[PDB]
Design a protein around this ligand. Structure first.
Ligand SMILES: Nc1ccc(S(=O)(=O)N2CCN(S(=O)(=O)c3ccc(O)c(O)c3)CC2)cc1
Ligand SMILES: Nc1ccc(S(=O)(=O)N2CCN(S(=O)(=O)c3ccc(O)c(O)c3)CC2)cc1
Ligand SMILES: O=P(O)(O)OC[C@H]1O[C@](O)(COP(=O)(O)O)[C@@H](O)[C@@H]1O
Ligand SMILES: O=P(O)(O)OC[C@H]1O[C@](O)(COP(=O)(O)O)[C@@H](O)[C@@H]1O
Ligand SMILES: O=P(O)(O)OC[C@H]1O[C@](O)(COP(=O)(O)O)[C@@H](O)[C@@H]1O
Ligand SMILES: O=P(O)(O)OC[C@H]1O[C@](O)(COP(=O)(O)O)[C@@H](O)[C@@H]1O
Ligand SMILES: O=C([O-])C(=O)[O-]
Ligand SMILES: O=C([O-])C(=O)[O-]
Ligand SMILES: O=C([O-])C(=O)[O-]
Ligand SMILES: O=C([O-])C(=O)[O-]
Ligand SMILES: [K+]
Ligand SMILES: [K+]
Ligand SMILES: [K+]
Ligand SMILES: [K+]
Ligand SMILES: [Mg+2]
Ligand SMILES: [Mg+2]
Ligand SMILES: [Mg+2]
Ligand SMILES: [Mg+2]
Lengths: 422, 425, 436, 425
């Protein structure tokens, strides 16, 4: 029964062609949904009660579009998101962090506009986790956004939106200084021929996967759902193919901001992503990611590849990792393990930000501390196991890979352990 | 000899990559497609696309197969649509650069436990009006195909039957259906209501992979450019869907309401043409050819053996085209199954085979009407030169190019066994 | 180039020109061959063990000391000739030569003692002489038995029974010497600790032109099973009388290593020849060159893909450790082991990194020479009061001994493999450590 | 049949990995194909008798090597006359006649910087006596090859030059030497004294790989069966060395003292024949063909394009042979470079090309003696039928087998461009 679920017959195929031939509509997904969903907040999704339903449906990141609305409007949206998120904090083993992303208006006909400087300042003051920087054309655009976030915004992730020909041509220099990329297909599809957008999307996703940096696929993914309860056949295909291309996140704009079916749009992205993730051909994908990732003397990078290899060897249900900044979880995510990466962190901000990395399930640790550091580490690992059991990730008898470090503080991950559950 | 400009076009840097990941990283929006569009476009005929003048614009935009949906309209209505298609096609017979065969496909209303009375009468109408293809609705098992085949009667055994897979039973009994069908249509409209909407992409990818393995045509259909029924430009999901159907391995892509009743039928055809050309250049032939070659069983059939040798030879020299002589279309279909980057120019005397080979990706039919030469070797040579001169006129070939030529040792269908490498003079 | 660019800047271009590293990075086996370079010097310690047969040319304590220094890892006693008194003196001389270097782990080299049986002769199974010789082996504490003419699983069960209850720890290496042994190979390997491709008799029992097929098949099956395989007989035959071997002999030794053999053997070359020390030096020199020429990129990929999925934590830790070692060009993998099993499971994946096995068992330290790339370190200190401290002291012993022996250098990365509780069978941890 | 798929290591040939290929090698799986690696036997006192030479030809000797380091010109002229008398004794049966090449192995430069005066005189002797090949000793750079070529004069332009790599400089300047040579000999005797003995296998494997990549012949030489100079059976290391030279990719294997002065010259040839046949069946063509195909550059030469198409077609149908017509041997060499499992039966009128193609693995030369037919197409057909009749008599072909036939569009060398699938009747 185990080997018939989650497209395991197609996963064992010797060629990609045989993998396609073995895909089965009756093979049900079992793993938790790994591709994060970004939902744009607006009149259709601003109330606390509506936001609670969207969190339950699968929303991981709330996007505030600063192209419309005042600072007062966006501050109320942030407060409503936080109220809805914290309404579930009474159950620590199931609490779900939700990131807040600020999407800038952009340069317009101008570099960094004066409105963007004020909006970025607002973001820092209101503790946003991510900035989706509009119309990034070159590396100096990213440096200007970073400078506008100031010394208090050093921890905010900058995701550069590629929306025109120049952004595509200068992609390598932009990715080098960014935390990740958004394929902003709306403007991209008007700036370059509509029939070329898929090439730019596939190239940018491939380059981000090679770099181990998050990539978001955005705009018109389920467009018809703004007025209709069900999407078109092209829309379900688009969502599935963004996941199969290698996207870390998928996005909803008008579908959740102003449409008549915001919750249904989130549920539809969740359902498609789960099916597409099981259809990933890990045999070739892992081989290529492993071969392309450079040789390294960084112990976190070395431990990450060893842990992913070990997880595939035993069909591990999960890789439990302790992380302060999210970096150790990101380095595991870059190899696309089938095993869920359960990231245990004390940082509320890192827990929200790791939603950018595919297959990372953040757990915010709020249990009393242990006096002995080794005992405190063991307790965080047991918290990951107990949360994993409650959420359906783990069962007694499963094998898990545990990734920890030799001393406190970020940057010292160097240990991988094979553990039997219960 | 070819130059650096040649190797920068048609995604050739991405084509030379050693891994699929590197192939993706090298895809370039500035690398322009050069090859002719190989994925055929099926356009549904209706009130928005029935007039002779509108049909001429659709042929110019790229329509290769006209679909008649027998779920609506009388036999008189469909006979007039067929006459209008044939009038529009024959309006280009005065210019060799523009004349192109256009197949006519009859899409049945559907079943009841099996073949409906209306389907028996509509299939009889198809035979009487000389249709090339039947898109059989709601095929659930091999006996449904046998019933359609029997209803094609004494005169219509040459009509191609493309089984439409529209429900759970059709997907589960796919192998037995494909075995007795000429090809398959992934009918996503009904499929997306019969099975969970989020599972349709798995059924599509599986069926395309199995048809590619079998070397039989597969059509991706329904809602590909849906928003274009009322809007002049499609959504980002719609352009993605068309490109991904080609990258999945679909031989044909289809338009339904977009061309039958929408406000932009010509624009919808132009959009599918533009996307298909871009997606075809982005195909990773290095792995695709290797896998098709490895999965295809060993064969003692000379047509199959010649086809793989010809496709291998075409890749070795970057051949502009593979010219093949065919009476039934079978030799061109066996070349198409290996997905060569070279265009397969199929020279035939059969007007029906010329229309039907549009079902096979990368096959460009040329109908030959010269009277037969008394010396057979001279008649073969005249036909090969006809393919070369047509290829020069259409832009496929230039003097100095290499072409692969596929023929047989004696007249009649079934004897293909020769591959030659010719330098264009 | 992008996959090695940062490490090339850090470690230098000289590092990446040695040990056939350009050929190791090739994308195809054809390109791997085209990049093999006679000027690319080997750097790693020799991983394929050398078995030397003891006889009149190599029996004296002084001669045995030179053979240990030259690279002999296993001493073979051929019970087809000589009395029990003769073999007991050979054993005593080997032990005296081995213990002359016991003042420090920098100089100590464990040497295994293997008893090669006379065989069944014209009989259907275990001969009476073999029963007596096997009892002699147990009484004299031999580490390994090379069982002659093994034809079926019941032959190995008879050898095991003849070793008695006190010889349960002795490794049985079945010698495949005839057509029946080749045809029943799978059942024989299943119950044996390893195999010897005994080419002398095999080349007379089957057509001489087919021996290479049997050798390559048996080595491949043993590599797939993760069990030791020995290539034996006439490897450097002309060196019995000449100081230099023929071109076919050097090729044979190199190709046995490239085929996947864990051990290579010398018979008359060391037992009766005029150049026993030179024969050992020649096998050492060829094996180091051939080990560097192994195409790890495809070998590791195929071993990984062919090995079934495993829920054994030692097996899971071993593949993770070998993957980590390849990622950082680790100098060594240090493993704690009681029986040698955790080191054997690392060895089956053929890491380029040396597997430094720290053990308290003198017998396991001798026996692990059967597994390619395992370097035994015998730990003699009594156990610390706190088990975690005792584990740490053993890992540090491996590091210090490794640095002092040139295996490790300051700045190197080492992979350390340990377990969660005392006793054999609980290996489950892999750590990445920087050498300071 | 199942019996067919159990022979010639076909279970090991179908394996998905090289490790599984090794695990499936079977000592009971008998070789069926003709032995493809040529045997070079050195002529000397043990092999000079015309009657002894007839036995060596029957045992499998393809090339007779004359070592000019020993003996006078009078001695070598008698060796040549004896070889030719033995070879021509079988000319009365044209369907079974085996061509045998004559190779002149030079003394070398000695302490000099380049071509010695003795080598100039010996090379002149070679041209005057019509030798087919020169094995040039101690080649250290491209200018050494040019000097050998100049010494052969205008009448020796057709003689093949095989450069012997015997020292560190020859290995380091290998690429420039191979570029101007027809092929290479790994001269392990001197190489094993010039560089450390433990490094010779690296030089051998590298040079074989580079020659295979270039599509040029490579010979493995010296001490392969050394103990057979005095003993009737070789050592285990010697049989392993011969098998591994074939598995490495050597086109030819050589015997020196084993045939020139030993007591078992015929048995040494029989032993190399037996080992080579076993090793050729153990070749993992699945990976080898894929790598040779991928590494070989794109080409616009029709002979090169036809060759890869023909080898691909042969693998598709398990062809028993590829029959090729050749004037210079070049069309057969281009098929050989892809290492088909199918025997390459090369039909030629050139007695010299028939002898020289023994340098290329898997090429079986047939000397056609009939004068040209008036109709060129009939002359081509008669030569293909001669290949089939010889193949049937020798055991290469049987009725029902498929063969690939490679020919050209006009008479004269350089115009090969046709591949044809033929059933043996
Ligand atoms: N980065 C990355 C790596 C691997 C993949 S994949 O899903 O394994 N996959 C994608 C598709 N390609 S492929 O070579 O384009 C392909 C497509 C269709 C076929 O029938 C076929 O034989 C080959 C083969 C590799 C996807 C993404
Ligand atoms: N040029 C050339 C190309 C291919 C071959 S080969 O025979 O297919 N070739 C042999 C050598 N290997 S291999 O990668 O060295 C190898 C050896 C042993 C193993 O068990 C294994 O898993 C891999 C690679 C495959 C031989 C020569
Ligand atoms: O992923 P990051 O940010 O490098 O954090 C990993 C760090 O977390 C730990 O596992 C636990 O550290 P803390 O006890 O400080 O939370 C460290 O050993 C390791 O260095
Ligand atoms: O593809 P098909 O239908 O088998 O037709 C291929 C046939 O065409 C030819 O090339 C030419 O035949 P005709 O002269 O009869 O048209 C034959 O030699 C070959 O058998
Ligand atoms: O390789 P083996 O025989 O399984 O031994 C590995 C064992 O060695 C250890 O690392 C140390 O165990 P000891 O303290 O008993 O020596 C264990 O944790 C582990 O189970
Ligand atoms: O291998 P080569 O030397 O290029 O010879 C191939 C030539 O042989 C032929 O098949 C037959 O030519 P001839 O009739 O002159 O012998 C030509 O068509 C072709 O050009
Ligand atoms: O800004 C965006 O999100 C876009 O244009 O798609
Ligand atoms: O009939 C169709 O085309 C469908 O249902 O998609
Ligand atoms: O017994 C042996 O060692 C042999 O036969 O090779
Ligand atoms: O000259 C030779 O043949 C040699 O040195 O091997
Ligand atoms: K915005
Ligand atoms: K219909
Ligand atoms: K013995
Ligand atoms: K000589
Ligand atoms: Mg935008
Ligand atoms: Mg329908
Ligand atoms: Mg023996
Ligand atoms: Mg020499």
């Amino acid at each position: 029964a185990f080997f018939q679920q989650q497209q395991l017959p197609a996963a064992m195929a010797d060629t990609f062609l045989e993998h396609l031939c073995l895909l089965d509509i009756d093979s049900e997904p079992v793993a938790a949904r790994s591709t994060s969903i970004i939902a744009t907040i607006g009149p259709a999704s601003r109330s606390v009660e509506r936001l609670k339903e969207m969190i339950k449906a699968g929303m991981n990141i709330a996007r505030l579009n600063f192209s419309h609305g005042s600072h007062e409007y966006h501050a109320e949206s942030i407060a409503n998101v936080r109220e809805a998120v914290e309404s579930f904090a009474g159950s620590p083993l199931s609490y779900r962090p939700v990131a807040i992303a600020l999407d800038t208006k952009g340069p317009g006909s101008g570099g960094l506009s004066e409105q963007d400087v004020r909006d970025l300042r607002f973001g820092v003051e209101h503790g946003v986790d991510i900035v989706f920087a509009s119309f990034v054309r070159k590396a100096s655009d990213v440096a200007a956004v970073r400078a506008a976030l100031g010394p208090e915004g050093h921890g905010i992730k900058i995701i550069s939106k590629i929306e025109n020909h120049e952004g595509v041509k200068r992609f390598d220099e932009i990715l080098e200084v960014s935390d990740g990329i958004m394929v902003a297909r709306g403007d991209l599809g008007i700036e370059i021929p509509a029939e070329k957008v898929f090439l730019a999307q596939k190239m940018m996703i491939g380059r981000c996967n090679l770099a181990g940096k998050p990539v978001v696929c955005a705009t018109q993914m389920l467009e018809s759902m703004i007025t209709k309860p069900r999407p078109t056949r092209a829309e379900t295909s688009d969502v599935a193919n963004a996941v199969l291309d290698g996207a870390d996140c998928i996005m909803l704009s008008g579908e959740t901001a102003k449409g008549n079916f915001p919750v249904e749009a989130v549920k539809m992205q969740h359902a498609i992503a789960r099916e597409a993730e099981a259809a990933v051909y890990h045999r070739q994908l892992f081989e290529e990611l492993r071969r392309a990732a450079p040789l390294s003397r960084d112990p976190t990078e070395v431990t990450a590849i060893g842990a992913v290899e070990a997880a595939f060897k035993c069909c591990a249900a999960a890789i439990i990792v302790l992380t302060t900044t999210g970096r150790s979880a990101q380095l595991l995510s870059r190899y696309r393990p089938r095993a869920a990466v359960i990231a245990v962190t004390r940082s509320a901000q890192a827990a929200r930000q790791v939603h950018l990395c595919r297959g990372v399930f953040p757990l915010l640790y709020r249990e009393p501390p242990e006096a002995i550091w080794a005992d405190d580490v063991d307790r965080r690992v047991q918290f990951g196991i107990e949360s994993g059991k409650l959420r359906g990730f783990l069962r007694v008898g499963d094998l898990v890979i545990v990734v920890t470090g030799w001393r406190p503080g970020s940057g010292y991950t160097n240990i991988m352990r094979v553990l039997s559950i219960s």
